[PDB]
């Protein structure tokens, strides 16, 4: 581990693209507490690194963003926010400043940034709605989360409507309300009952959610609906894996019997 | 050290025995490859190549795919090569400003071609991993003083004349069309005309200009009242 | 402002130079013990010559009887010694004792009695023989007393001379490791002198004889009268020290200036340098405080600070003559007055004591003092830069090849004192001994007058150093005994140093007086001075004058020829003459394969002017051709057009990289240019195509073809017109229009924020190629005409850089700027008057340059448009802004700026910090080599040997054909071939190879080569090396990436390092038909 400023400088000469020792040096000046040398150091780094190193550029962007969140003020946040959105991809800078807001615990200001990125970039992007739903359901605000899903439904195209109701149902099954996830899932199969990948993520999410009677009735609904041979044996064998992981031999025999009368057609 | 055959990112190393030197105390040339995914129409069925050998060209990949099909007996036929700025000269289009470093992209004909050369290079990775002596020999189209005097050679006057004349003709056609398009009374849909001037010929340049871009304090009675205040 | 900065700086120097009261108290306690000792010394009476002979024969102390010894047949007087009057003399006595590195001295006068004086003791060595037996008896009795009180354990006593006066020997006591003053580093001197007013001044005058055999002996009169009147000076300086307050700081400032220049208070008439130091400075500034006006005005006042006193006294020594026009007169015990009659000797005269002060200074010492006074007056009146350390902190007197412009080693195998009459061509007789008492003085003055009359106007100033002069001899010796130098005399050899007028450095004939009927006295001395070499020639216009014609030679100058002839004629037939240093330098400069190249001088420009003549013929033709746009200007911008090409331009020599000199061809303004950069370059190509067609259709004797220019990145259609004119020359016309700067600014505007510095480098390369190059060319050609020696200096410096393999990555205009720095600003040195002195001054400057703190600001002008205050401070603000944006210098190292270019980046951009540190390290290693070892042929050969070490690999390559004759250097290709492909065949690729591999491995490797194969390809000119350094970036091992831009090898499944052997085999397969040897580390 290097400790002296001259050795630090000679290693910055020796490796101009080593962003890891760049953040080691910025960490050193944070332990010695010089924010002026911090901003001039970020300026010197952005002057000296290459232009085709966009990942390192984004890294020093979020580096100056972290320093101005922990030790800077809101006007400097606005200035570096504007310059970063001018240089690099503004939606990415929106999400990084969002994440730093999450790890710095400013709920109301992070929420204002959610509104901002949703009004500017909500016509074509979906990950901002994903992150807004995650924040709001960690805040446990279900009806406003559903109205954010409605804003996505009115502001996105149709395939993006499908993606946003799918992701909201997944995060509902993960940490949100399971019955709300079930309701949006049955509504989605009411809009489109053919989508085999959608049925697949639905049955994977119920077999991770561990609700036995719904596993049963959904699988019987898969029996009633049209399924091809490869996807049929896929759902059948994954149901076998679920039933052998939990241990019900009567259901094992039931699935083998229904599989025999399925292949005898 | 001979079993380093696949990186965690997913890159396959392709070593090469180089032609040895007469005064050297064989050797290894480490080539990497991974298939590339893109929604671009002219960037379908393409292979990302990392650390290409020196001055490797269409002929180099032709000899390489010939050796590959002769060894592993698959059907794979390459089409073209992309991103050959092996030096770093054609990076920035100054022409377009006015009006994948060290990598290459290899084009194939179909999915059969790409999957056959893919399993061929996979078997080549296992070939180096188990028996690193049964590999290919990468060769250069090794330049001599004939290619050096090509690098120091005068230019063909007839080729120069033809290139100059055709470029001037196409440039004049494009310039005349853009000039007429600017000064052809560009009326909007909602009745609005547009203000151009005499001697302008680029609506691009109009957009670029856009992108580049009496207090009489003693007059009133209240102001002279404050003037009296400031005397006091 | 000048007051503030100079006051703070003199405060810094005075706190640096100030001594300590501990040293003061130690030395005064020691001299108090010496006081007690001298009062315990007992007195004695009249005794005879044989009696003191037996005395100092049975005793160990030997009396220092000077030449000639006293003889009892001719001495009718005897001896005595009574209580001497003791006093302390020195800077400490003036309360100005300062720290000196090698040591300092406080002298003590022991004053001889009037009752011991006889009234005719001043005649014929009597008083000085009395002084010698006086000091010998005092040494014996002080020896008894030191053996008594046990101070013999660490005190060492020797005989010496008062300021190198061989007629006046003194004593010197020193302490080695309670009365020990070894920490003080002092050495006390014991002087035997006379009281005030002890002999007749009117019979003691410089024109009054005191040696009878009528010529006088003014320096001996000065010695006896100064040893009489030592203490009147001391009370007068004590009075003036009471009168003015800043005297001590003024005199330490003067003393440090004198010792930094190299002078001293020693004797200079023995073939030495000095005569002016602390004591002379104090007496002179006291006289100038007394007055110094033309009608006895005062020049210096009591209320003046040391800055004002120094500026005044140096203004006086610069403006007023004291040797050939006038003299100064003052009274010590009422006012000073300058009078207008030169006495052909330094003349500051006191009538209250009837003394001339500066008789220790010779004419050459006064001349060099005049030139130094002028230089420092110029640096004082300089208001732009900071001249303070420039004046006071650079001892130039270290290297004689950097202090003087021509050094000459001459050996004189004399023999013996009676062998003088056979070993000399002059005569040292009785009256010669009277005028020039010591043989060293006589021979030195003979060499000065002979060499001065021989050279005439080819020298500004002269200096004769006597190498081997020991001014120290023990007590047991009568004088300084030696056997060095082929004789028994106190010198090894003679170093003749010349400050040379560079314009008349190489005039072929040495013009004398005209021819009348009667042989004039001047032509008589001419004829008896030249003998066989003289003649009478009728010139081109018809004058009939005497002149001795010489012949020019490249390897050696006419100064060497003429001083060889003069010393071997009018001095002796046995002396040996040498300057093999400058002989080898002129040998190391290349010699073009042309008729009469050997006898051609080094200042000849006839090849360049022939090139210019052919260019002007082509210029007329292309100017009167007929084009759709008429031609506006044609500007030659080539290195030959500024006389900084390395190989001189030989006709039809088409393998030198500077064969094609660049000309700019600019048409008139036109509104119908295209506005798209590629089509713009294509339109310029169209104009060049029409030009080529018209040339081949009208003036068929000219030949022509078309090449590309890839030096500008991303502008790939730049086509240049190669024209071969039948006097054997090549010009590549490139076209400059009124739209290039506009399109480049528009491109750098429309480029996004990542690629902006790349287009900054692009536009900067464009500027340095096209626009500021013309300004650079005309400026350097003009100031080269004013400074002839700039072209051989820059040629030698480019040769040095090419053999050290830095030229491939350092551009030629930066080479020319860093070469021309000492010619533009030679402060505090002189303007260079030799290839040797110029090149070594460049090396010393580039070694002492600290570019991390110091920027280079130049004003390329003729000698006395200069950069005024506002422009200077603006350039310095640009520099400090660049250093705030880059403090360490990973991106720029040399900030060079001139009037044509106040930017500071334009020529030194894109320079590897390894290359810059390697250049500074090479300069430091070179100057340390010249510090430890004497300058000679082996040292300069080691200077020109290439390094080949510190490189991680070297690649030795040869060409199938030696290229020395084709490059145009004799140890010749007559005509152009019928095939331009065969031109490319005889061409050489190695620079394009190393450039393309630099472009390939720009991320990881640094590869350098030799550019000039015609000089550096061995004796045949067919070899070239490729040295290669690995970056620490890939010396370390790193994570696998996608844009790593190197040929690698993984050490595991994640981390990789570089593939050295694969790089080596890539280069080997590239140069398969050319690479021979390859060494690795």
User: Which domain CATH number covers C478?
Assistant: 3.30.70.3020
Nearest-angstrom CA–CA distance, A171 and A21: 37
Nearest-angstrom CA–CA distance, B176 and B187: 20
Is-contact C704 C694, C-beta < 8 A?
Answer: no
Mutate to test the interface with C, among A2, A7, A13, A55 (most CBs of C within 10 A): A13
End-to-end CA distance of chain A: 71
Mutate to test the interface with B, among C676, C687, C992 (most CBs of B within 10 A): C676
Count CB atoms within 10 A of the CB of residue C669.
11
Token reading at C646:
């390395």
For residues B42 and B76, membership in a common domain is answered with yes
Nearest-angstrom CA–CA distance, B88 and B183: 40
Q: Which of residues 888-907 of C touch A (CB under 8 A)?
A: 888, 890-891
Least CA distance to C1037: which residue of chain A? A15
Q: Which residues contact A100 (CB under 8 A, 6 or more apart)?
A: A62, A65, A66, A69
B92 and C758 within 8 Å at the Cβ level: the answer is yes
Instruction: Give pairs for C413-422: CB < 8 Å, separation 24+.
Output: C413/C485, C413/C486, C413/C487, C413/C574, C413/C575, C413/C576, C414/C485, C414/C486, C414/C487, C414/C489, C414/C572, C414/C574, C415/C486, C415/C487, C416/C487, C416/C488, C417/C488
Closest CA to C949 of C800, C1063, C804, C1064: C804
Q: What's the number of CA atoms in the CB half-sphere (13 Å) around residue C191?
A: 27
Tell me the Cα Rg of chain A: 26
DSSP H or E stretch at residue C879: helix C869-885
For residues C748 and C884, membership in a common domain is answered with yes
Tell me the Cα Rg of chain B: 32
Closest CA to C899 of C382, C384, C387, C378: C384
Mutate to test the interface with B, among C1053, C1056, C1080 (most CBs of B within 10 A): C1053
**Smallest Cβ distance to A87: which of C753, C757, C1032?**
C753
For residues C817 and C681, membership in a common domain is answered with yes
A87 touches chain C (CB under 8 A): yes
For residues C387 and C412, membership in a common domain is answered with no
Cis peptide bond N-terminal to A184, omega within 30: no
Nearest-angstrom CA–CA distance, C701 and A66: 73
Is-contact C123 C74, C-beta < 8 A?
Answer: no
**Smallest Cβ distance to C984: which of B86, B92, B149?**
B149
For residues B146 and B88, membership in a common domain is answered with no
Into how many domains does chain B fold?
2
**Percent composition of chain C: helix, strand, coil (DSSP 3-state, to 5):** 40, 15, 45
**Smallest Cβ distance to B167: which of C679, C722, C762?**
C679
C757 touches chain A (CB under 8 A): yes
C674 and B86 within 8 Å at the Cβ level: the answer is no
- Exposed, middle or buried by CB within 10 Å (0-12, 13-18, 19+), for B162? exposed
For residues C176 and C236, membership in a common domain is answered with yes
Q: Which of residues 816-875 of C touch A (CB under 8 A)?
A: none
For residues B42 and B89, membership in a common domain is answered with yes
**Smallest Cβ distance to B145: which of C677, C1064, C1073?**
C1073
**Smallest Cβ distance to B51: which of C747, C749, C1047?**
C1047
Grouping H, G, I as helix, E, B as strand and the rest as coil, residue C171 is: strand
Instruction: Kindly write down the DSSP assignment for every residue of C835-856, as one continuous string.
Output: HHHHHHHHHHHHHH--TTT--E
For residues B10 and B93, membership in a common domain is answered with yes
Is-contact C493 C410, C-beta < 8 A?
Answer: yes
C755 touches chain A (CB under 8 A): yes
- Exposed, middle or buried by CB within 10 Å (0-12, 13-18, 19+), for C342? middle
Distances (CA, A) of C756 to B129, B207, C219, C235: 46, 21, 76, 75
Mutate to test the interface with C, among A15, A18, A58 (most CBs of C within 10 A): A15
For residues B21 and B43, membership in a common domain is answered with yes
Distances (CA, A) of B182 to B99, C676, C952: 15, 17, 61
Closest CA to C682 of B97, B154, B96, B168: B168
Nearest-angstrom CA–CA distance, B25 and B206: 66
Is-contact C897 C903, C-beta < 8 A?
Answer: yes
Q: Is residue B30 part of a domain?
A: yes
Nearest-angstrom CA–CA distance, C16 and C14: 5
B98 touches chain C (CB under 8 A): yes
Way it was determined:
cryo-EM
Question: Of C878, C913, C948, which residue sits at a domain end?
Answer: C948
Question: Of B72, B92, B109, which residue sits at a domain end?
Answer: B109
> Torsions phi, psi of C716, nearest 5?
-100, 0
Q: Is residue C1010 part of a domain?
A: yes
For residues B42 and B93, membership in a common domain is answered with yes
B133 touches chain C (CB under 8 A): no
Least CA distance to B86: which residue of chain C? C1000
C1050 and B30 within 8 Å at the Cβ level: the answer is yes
Per-residue three-class SS string for A30-65: HHCCCHHHHHHHHHHHHHHCCCCCHHHHHHHHHHHH
C1065 and B9 within 8 Å at the Cβ level: the answer is no
For residues C32 and C145, membership in a common domain is answered with yes
Instruction: Give pairs for C618-626: CB < 8 Å, separation 24+.
Output: C618/C702, C618/C723, C618/C725, C618/C731, C621/C695, C621/C698, C621/C699, C621/C702, C622/C665, C622/C691, C622/C695, C625/C691, C625/C694, C625/C695, C625/C698, C626/C694
DSSP-assigned beta bridge partners for residue C1058: C1048
C676 and B99 within 8 Å at the Cβ level: the answer is yes
B11 touches chain C (CB under 8 A): yes
Q: Is residue B140 part of a domain?
A: yes
Is the alpha carbon torsion for C348, C353, C354, C358 positive or negative? Answer: negative
Strands C355-356 and C348-350, bridge-based pairing: antiparallel
C755 and A51 within 8 Å at the Cβ level: the answer is yes
Instruction: Kindly write down the DSSP assignment for every residue of A171-218, as one continuous string.
Output: HHHHTS-HHHHHHHHHHHHHH-S--HHHHHHHHHHHHHHT-HHHHHHH
Nearest-angstrom CA–CA distance, C284 and C281: 5
B102 touches chain C (CB under 8 A): yes
Cis peptide bond N-terminal to A250, omega within 30: no
Is-contact C566 C451, C-beta < 8 A?
Answer: yes
C755 and A14 within 8 Å at the Cβ level: the answer is no
Nearest-angstrom CA–CA distance, B198 and C892: 47
Grouping H, G, I as helix, E, B as strand and the rest as coil, residue A13 is: helix
CA distance C1063 to chain B (A): 9
Sheet holding C703-708, edge to edge: C631-636, C660-667, C729-735, C719-725, C703-708
Nearest-angstrom CA–CA distance, C562 and C500: 14
Closest CA to C121 of C133, C109, C129: C129
DSSP H or E stretch at residue A161: helix A158-174
For residues B66 and B129, membership in a common domain is answered with no
DSSP-assigned beta bridge partners for residue A70: none
Into how many domains does chain C fold?
5
Q: Which residues contact C1005 (CB under 8 A, 6 or more apart)?
A: C997, C998, C1028, C1029, C1030, C1031, C1063
Is the alpha carbon torsion for C649, C651, C657, C662 positive or negative? Answer: positive
Provide the b/e sequence for C713-729 (b: ≥16 CB within 10 Å).
bbbebbbbbbbbbeebb
Closest CA to C731 of C612, C593, C604: C612
Is-contact C36 C116, C-beta < 8 A?
Answer: no
DSSP-assigned beta bridge partners for residue C1068: none
Q: Is residue B206 part of a domain?
A: no
For residues C666 and C811, membership in a common domain is answered with yes
Token reading at C404:
């003087």
For residues B101 and B117, membership in a common domain is answered with no
CATH number of the domain that B125 lies in?
Answer: 6.10.250.2760
Token reading at C795:
């040629």
CA distance A5 to chain C (A): 12
Angle of the C439-455 helix axis to the C521-530 helix axis, nearest 10: 110
Question: Of C369, C399, C429, which residue sits at a domain end?
Answer: C399
Nearest-angstrom CA–CA distance, B172 and B162: 15
Nearest-angstrom CA–CA distance, C766 and C909: 12
DSSP H or E stretch at residue C230: helix C230-243
Nearest-angstrom CA–CA distance, C635 and C340: 55
**Percent composition of chain A: helix, strand, coil (DSSP 3-state, to 5):** 80, 0, 20
DSSP H or E stretch at residue B31: strand B31-36
Q: Which residues contact C235 (CB under 8 A, 6 or more apart)?
A: none
**Smallest Cβ distance to C1036: which of A15, A16, A53?**
A15
Provide the b/e sequence for C11-50 (b: ≥16 CB within 10 Å).
eebeeebebeeebeebbeebbeebeebbeebeeeeebebe
For residues C975 and C847, membership in a common domain is answered with no
- Exposed, middle or buried by CB within 10 Å (0-12, 13-18, 19+), for C527? middle
Residues in chain A: 265
Least CA distance to A43: which residue of chain C? C885
For residues C187 and C270, membership in a common domain is answered with no
Q: Find the domain containing C235 and state its range.
A: 19-193+227-243
Closest CA to C562 of C484, C498, C486, C622: C498
Is-contact A223 A235, C-beta < 8 A?
Answer: no
Is-contact C792 C835, C-beta < 8 A?
Answer: yes
DSSP assigned state of A105: T
Is-contact C999 C992, C-beta < 8 A?
Answer: no
Q: Name subunits touching C (3+ CB pairs < 8 A).
A: A, B
Question: Of B153, B169, B185, which residue sits at a domain end?
Answer: B169
For residues B64 and B140, membership in a common domain is answered with no
CA distance A87 to chain C (A): 6
Mutate to test the interface with C, among B98, B138, B176 (most CBs of C within 10 A): B98
B99 touches chain C (CB under 8 A): yes
Q: Is residue C212 part of a domain?
A: no
Question: Of B169, B204, B220, which residue sits at a domain end?
Answer: B169
Q: Is residue C530 part of a domain?
A: no
Q: Is residue B216 part of a domain?
A: no
Q: Is residue C933 part of a domain?
A: yes
C978 vs B contacts (CB less than 8 Å): none
For residues B114 and B131, membership in a common domain is answered with yes
Strands B78-82 and B103-108, bridge-based pairing: antiparallel
B18 vs C contacts (CB less than 8 Å): 1062, 1065, 1069
A9 vs C contacts (CB less than 8 Å): 888
Is the alpha carbon torsion for C237, C238, C240, C246 positive or negative? Answer: positive
Least CA distance to C705: which residue of chain B? B154
Question: Of C371, C399, C427, which residue sits at a domain end?
Answer: C399
Q: Is residue B179 part of a domain?
A: no
DSSP assigned state of C754: T
Q: Find the domain containing B123 and state its range.
A: 110-169
For residues C490 and C585, membership in a common domain is answered with no
C722 and B154 within 8 Å at the Cβ level: the answer is yes
Residue with token string 């671009």? B40
**Smallest Cβ distance to A52: which of C885, C1036, C1043?**
C1043
A16 vs C contacts (CB less than 8 Å): 890, 1033
Mutate to test the interface with C, among A47, A49, A82 (most CBs of C within 10 A): A47
For residues C886 and C996, membership in a common domain is answered with no
Tell me the Cα Rg of chain C: 36
For residues B7 and B91, membership in a common domain is answered with yes
**Smallest Cβ distance to B144: which of C683, C750, C1072?**
C1072
Distance of CA C278 to the CA centre of its chain: 25
For residues C390 and C469, membership in a common domain is answered with no
The reported resolution of this PDB entry, expressed in Å, is 3.8
For residues C903 and C957, membership in a common domain is answered with no
B185 touches chain C (CB under 8 A): no
B7 touches chain C (CB under 8 A): yes
A14 and C1032 within 8 Å at the Cβ level: the answer is yes
């Amino acid at each position: 581990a290097p400790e002296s400023v001259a050795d630090f400088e000679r290693l910055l000469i020796g490796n101009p693209n080593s962003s890891v020792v760049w953040m080691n040096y910025m960490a050193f000046q944070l332990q010695l507490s010089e924010i002026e040398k911090a901003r001039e150091l970020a300026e010197r780094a952005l002057k000296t690194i290459n232009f085709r190193e966009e990942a390192e550029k984004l890294n020093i962007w979020i580096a100056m963003l972290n320093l101005e969140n922990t030790f800077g003020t809101e006007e400097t946040l606005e200035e570096v926010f504007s310059r970063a959105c001018q240089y690099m991809d503004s939606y990415t800078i929106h999400t990084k400043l969002l994440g730093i807001y999450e790890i710095s615990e400013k709920f109301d200001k992070a929420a204002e940034l959610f509104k901002a990125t949703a009004k500017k970039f909500g016509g074509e992007k979906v990950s901002i709605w994903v992150s807004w739903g995650d924040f709001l359901i960690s805040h446990n605000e279900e009806q406003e989360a559903r109205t954010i899903l409605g804003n996505a439904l009115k502001a996105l195209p149709k395939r993006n409507h499908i993606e946003v109701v799918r992701k909201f149902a997944q995060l509902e099954f993960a940490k949100g309300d399971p019955e709300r996830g079930r309701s949006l899932f049955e509504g989605l199969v009411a809009d489109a009952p053919k989508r085999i990948d959608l049925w697949n993520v639905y049955v994977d999410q119920e077999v991770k959610a561990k609700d036995k009677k719904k596993v049963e009735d959904l699988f019987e609904r898969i029996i009633t609906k049209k399924i091809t041979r490869k996807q049929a044996k896929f759902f059948f064998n994954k149901w076998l894996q679920f039933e052998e992981s939990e241990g019900d031999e009567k259901t094992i025999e039931y699935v083998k019997a229904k599989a025999t009368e399925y292949v005898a057609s | 050290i001979e079993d380093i055959s696949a990186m965690k990112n997913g890159f396959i190393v392709v070593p090469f025995k180089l032609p040895d030197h007469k005064a050297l105390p064989a050797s290894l040339h480490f080539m990497f490859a991974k298939r590339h995914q893109s929604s671009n129409s002219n960037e379908s069925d393409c292979l990302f190549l990392v650390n290409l050998p020196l001055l490797s060209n269409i002929e180099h990949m032709k000899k390489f795919v010939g050796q590959l099909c002769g060894k592993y007996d698959t059907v794979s036929h390459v089409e073209e090569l992309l991103y050959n700025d092996e030096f770093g000269l054609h990076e920035v289009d100054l022409s377009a400003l006015t009006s994948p470093r060290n990598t290459a992209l290899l084009k194939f004909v179909d999915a059969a071609s790409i999957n056959n050369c893919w399993n061929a290079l996979k078997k080549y990775s296992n070939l180096h991993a188990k028996h690193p002596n049964e590999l290919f020999e990468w060769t250069y189209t090794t330049p001599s003083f004939t290619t050096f005097v090509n690098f120091y050679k005068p230019l063909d006057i007839d080729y120069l004349k033809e290139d100059i004349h055709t470029h001037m003709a196409i440039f004049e056609q494009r310039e005349a069309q853009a000039q007429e398009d600017v000064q052809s009374s560009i009326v909007d849909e909602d009745g609005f005309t547009l203000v151009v001037g005499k001697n302008t010929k680029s609506l691009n340049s109009i957009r670029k200009k856009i992108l580049n871009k009496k207090a009489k304090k003693d007059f009133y009675r209240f102001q002279v009242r404050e003037r009296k205040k400031q005397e006091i | 402002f000048k007051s503030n900065i100079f006051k703070l700086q003199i405060d810094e120097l005075l706190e640096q130079v100030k001594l300590k009261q501990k040293h003061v108290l130690k030395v005064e306690k020691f001299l108090h013990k010496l006081y007690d000792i001298l009062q315990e010394i007992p007195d004695w009476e009249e005794k005879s010559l044989a009696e003191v002979d037996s005395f100092f024969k049975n005793k160990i102390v030997s009396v220092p009887f000077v030449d000639p010894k006293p003889i009892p047949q001719n001495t009718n007087y005897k001896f005595n010694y009574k209580k001497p009057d003791i006093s302390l003399i020195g800077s400490f006595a003036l309360k100005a004792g300062i720290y000196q590195p090698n040591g300092s001295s406080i002298d003590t006068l022991l004053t001889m009695p009037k009752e011991l004086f006889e009234k005719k003791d001043f005649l014929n060595f009597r008083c000085l023989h009395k002084r010698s037996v006086y000091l010998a008896y005092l040494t014996h009795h002080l020896l008894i007393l030191l053996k008594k009180d046990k101070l013999d354990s660490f005190l060492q006593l020797e005989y010496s001379y008062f300021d190198n006066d061989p007629l006046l020997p003194i004593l010197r006591i020193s302490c080695s490791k309670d009365y020990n003053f070894y920490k003080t580093r002092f050495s006390i001197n014991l002087l035997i002198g006379f009281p005030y007013k002890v002999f007749e001044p009117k019979k003691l005058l410089p024109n009054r004889n005191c040696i009878r055999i009528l010529p006088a002996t003014p320096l001996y009169n000065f010695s006896v009268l100064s040893s009489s009147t030592h203490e009147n000076y001391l009370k007068y300086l004590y009075k003036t020290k009471k009168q003015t307050e800043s005297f001590v700081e003024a005199t330490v400032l003067g003393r440090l200036w004198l010792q930094q220049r190299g002078f001293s208070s020693n004797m200079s008439h023995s073939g030495s340098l000095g005569g002016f130091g602390t004591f002379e400075f104090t007496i002179l500034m006291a006289a100038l405080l007394n007055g110094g006006g033309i009608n006895s005005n005062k020049i210096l006042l009591h209320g003046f600070s040391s800055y004002q006193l120094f500026k005044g006294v140096i203004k006086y020594l610069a403006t007023m003559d004291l040797c050939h026009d006038g003299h100064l007169q003052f009274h010590s015990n009422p006012a000073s007055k300058y009078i207008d009659e030169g006495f052909q000797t330094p003349t500051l005269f006191d009538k209250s004591t009837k003394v001339n002060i500066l008789t220790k200074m010779t004419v050459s010492s006064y001349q060099i003092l005049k030139e130094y006074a002028g230089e420092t007056l110029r640096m004082l009146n300089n208001v732009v830069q900071d001249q303070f350390s420039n004046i006071f902190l650079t001892n130039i007197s270290r290297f004689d090849n950097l202090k003087y412009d021509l050094c000459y080693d001459v050996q004189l195998p004399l023999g013996k004192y009676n062998n003088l009459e056979t070993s000399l061509a002059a005569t040292f007789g009785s009256m010669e001994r009277v005028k020039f008492i010591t043989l060293e003085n006589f021979l030195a003055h003979k060499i000065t007058n002979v060499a001065r009359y021989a050279l005439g106007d080819r020298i500004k100033y002269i200096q004769i150093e006597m190498v081997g002069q020991k001014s120290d001899f023990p007590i047991t010796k009568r004088k300084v005994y030696s056997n060095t130098g082929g004789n028994h005399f106190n010198f090894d050899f003679v170093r003749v140093k010349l400050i040379v007028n560079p314009s008349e450095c190489d005039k072929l004939v040495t013009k004398g007086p005209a021819h009348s009927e009667t042989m004039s006295t001047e032509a008589a001395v001419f004829k008896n001075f030249w003998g066989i070499k003289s003649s009478l020639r009728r010139f081109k216009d018809g004058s009939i004058t005497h002149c001795c014609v010489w012949s020019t030679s490249s390897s050696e100058p006419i100064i060497s020829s003429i001083v060889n002839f003069a010393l071997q004629k009018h001095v002796s037939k046995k002396a040996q003459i040498s300057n093999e240093t400058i002989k080898k330098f002129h040998n190391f400069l290349p010699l073009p394969n042309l008729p009469s190249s050997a006898k051609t001088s080094v200042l000849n420009l006839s090849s360049f002017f022939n090139l210019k003549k052919s260019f002007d013929d082509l210029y007329k033709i292309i100017f009167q051709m007929k084009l759709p746009l008429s031609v506006k200007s044609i500007l030659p911008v080539g290195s030959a057009f500024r006389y900084t090409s390395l190989c001189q331009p030989v006709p039809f020599a088409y393998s030198d990289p500077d064969f094609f000199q660049d000309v700019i061809l600019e048409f008139e303004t036109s509104p119908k240019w295209p506005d798209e950069i590629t089509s713009l370059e294509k339109a310029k190509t169209a104009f060049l195509l029409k030009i080529q067609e018209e040339l081949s259709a009208n003036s068929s004797t000219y030949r022509s073809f078309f090449s590309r220019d890839e030096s500008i990145p991303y502008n790939l259609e730049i086509v240049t017109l190669n024209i071969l004119t039948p006097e054997g020359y090549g010009f590549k016309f490139r076209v400059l229009t009124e739209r290039d700067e506009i399109l480049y600014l528009r491109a750098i505007a429309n480029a996004r924020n990542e690629l902006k510095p790349e287009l900054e480098a692009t536009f900067l390369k464009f500027t340095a190629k096209y626009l500021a190059s013309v300004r650079h060319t005309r400026t350097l050609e003009n100031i080269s005409h004013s400074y002839q020696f700039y072209s051989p200096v820059v040629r030698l410096f480019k040769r040095w850089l090419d053999t050290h393999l830095l030229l491939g990555h350092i551009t030629d205009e930066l080479a020319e700027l860093i070469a021309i720095k000492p010619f533009v600003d030679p402060a505090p040195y002189f303007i260079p008057g030799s290839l040797e002195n110029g090149f070594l001054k460049v090396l010393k400057f580039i070694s002492q340059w600290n570019w991390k703190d110091d920027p280079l600001i130049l004003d390329l002008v003729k000698p006395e448009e200069r950069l005024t205050l506002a422009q200077y401070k603006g350039i310095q603000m640009n520099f400090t802004n660049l250093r705030n944006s880059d403090p360490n210098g990973t991106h720029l190292q040399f900030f060079v700026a001139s009037k044509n270019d106040p930017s500071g980046i334009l020529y030194s951009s894109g320079i590897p910090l390894p290359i810059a540190t390697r250049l500074t390290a090479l300069a430091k290693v070179a100057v340390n080599l010249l510090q430890t070892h004497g300058l000679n042929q082996q040292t300069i050969n080691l200077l020109f040997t290439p390094g080949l070490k510190d490189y991680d690999f070297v690649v030795d390559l040869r060409t199938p054909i030696g290229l020395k004759s084709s490059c145009g250097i004799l140890s010749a290709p007559s005509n152009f071939p019928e095939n331009l492909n065969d031109l490319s065949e005889k061409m050489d690729p190695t620079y394009q190879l190393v450039k393309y591999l630099n472009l390939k491995y720009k991320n990881s490797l640094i590869l350098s080569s030799r550019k000039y194969i015609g000089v550096n390809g061995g004796e045949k000119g067919d070899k070239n090396v490729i040295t290669g350094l690995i970056k620490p970036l890939f010396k370390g091992a790193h994570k696998f990436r996608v844009n790593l831009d190197c040929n690698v090898k993984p050490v595991d499944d994640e981390n990789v390092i570089l593939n050295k052997e694969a790089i080596f085999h890539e280069i080997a397969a590239f140069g398969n038909d050319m690479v021979i040897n390859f060494e690795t580390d």
